[PDB]
Amino acid sequence: MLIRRLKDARLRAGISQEKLGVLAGIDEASASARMNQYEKGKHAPDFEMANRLAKVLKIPVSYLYTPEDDLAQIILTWNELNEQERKRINFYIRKK
Amino acid sequence: MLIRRLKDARLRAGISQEKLGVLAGIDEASASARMNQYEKGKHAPDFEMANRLAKVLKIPVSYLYTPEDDLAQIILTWNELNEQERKRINFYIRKK
């Protein structure tokens, strides 16, 4: 998982490390330390934990694993497109 | 990592479990077993190994972590768009 993706998504949500960890199911006594460890690259979450974090942060989980900034932005944006916008992109992509 | 993403990307490349493992730097004696284990969900690769697999398979690594089929397809397709198509999508996404 890319640490800067996790940090960015948390900053965008506007929530603290402790609050993110807590909503992700971590004992609040350890919540902030655990999140800080992930964000500093000391430990990597497993895919199951990353999915929990992504759910709390309201992002597609694969955003956290996307090294390419342009693709990351597309992922983050797709996430919030209305159904007509998604259709247009889906159609544009069809057969390509 | 999603096992079906790994398997699909390997089938699309048209290469065997052994050849994928080998090009990914695994001792050929263990290559196919190791790949089969990943593809059957017995072990999960770490992000560094997933990046190696994705490089061999010529896909954005985050494809392997994308649960949503529509987003997966967008990722796989973006991967192969010409520079003008990418520009159009980038522009469409701007400010959204």
Numbering used by the authors:
A (entry chain A), B (entry chain B): 1 to 96
Source paper text:
Controller proteins play a key role in the temporal regulation of gene expression in bacterial restriction–modification (R–M) systems and are important mediators of horizontal gene transfer. They form the basis of a highly cooperative, concentration-dependent genetic switch involved in both activation and repression of R–M genes. Here we present biophysical, biochemical, and high-resolution structural analysis of a novel class of controller proteins, exemplified by C.Csp231I. In contrast to all previously solved C-protein structures, each protein subunit has two extra helices at the C-terminus, which play a large part in maintaining the dimer interface.
The protein crystallised in two space groups: a monoclinic form (P21) and a cubic form (F4132). The calculated Matthews coefficients were 2.38 Å3 Da− 1 (one monomer in the asymmetric unit) and 2.01 Å3 Da− 1 (two monomers in the asymmetric unit) for the cubic and monoclinic structures, respectively. Structures from the two alternative space groups are very similar, and a least-squares fit of the monomer from the cubic unit cell data to either of the monomers from the monoclinic unit cell data gave an RMSD of 0.94 Å. A comparison of the dimers (formed by a crystallographic dyad in the cubic form and by a noncrystallographic dyad in the monoclinic form) resulted in an RMSD of 1.31 Å, reflecting a slight hinge movement at the dyad interface. A similar analysis of the monoclinic form of C.Csp231I reveals the same major features at the dimer interface, with an equivalent pair of interchain H-bonds. The buried surface area is reduced by ca 200 Å due to a small outward rotation of the final C-terminal helices relative to each other (residues 88–96), which may in part be due to the observed differences in crystal packing contacts in this region. This is not so apparent in the monoclinic form, where crystal packing forces stabilise this region and the B-factors are more evenly distributed throughout the entire structure.
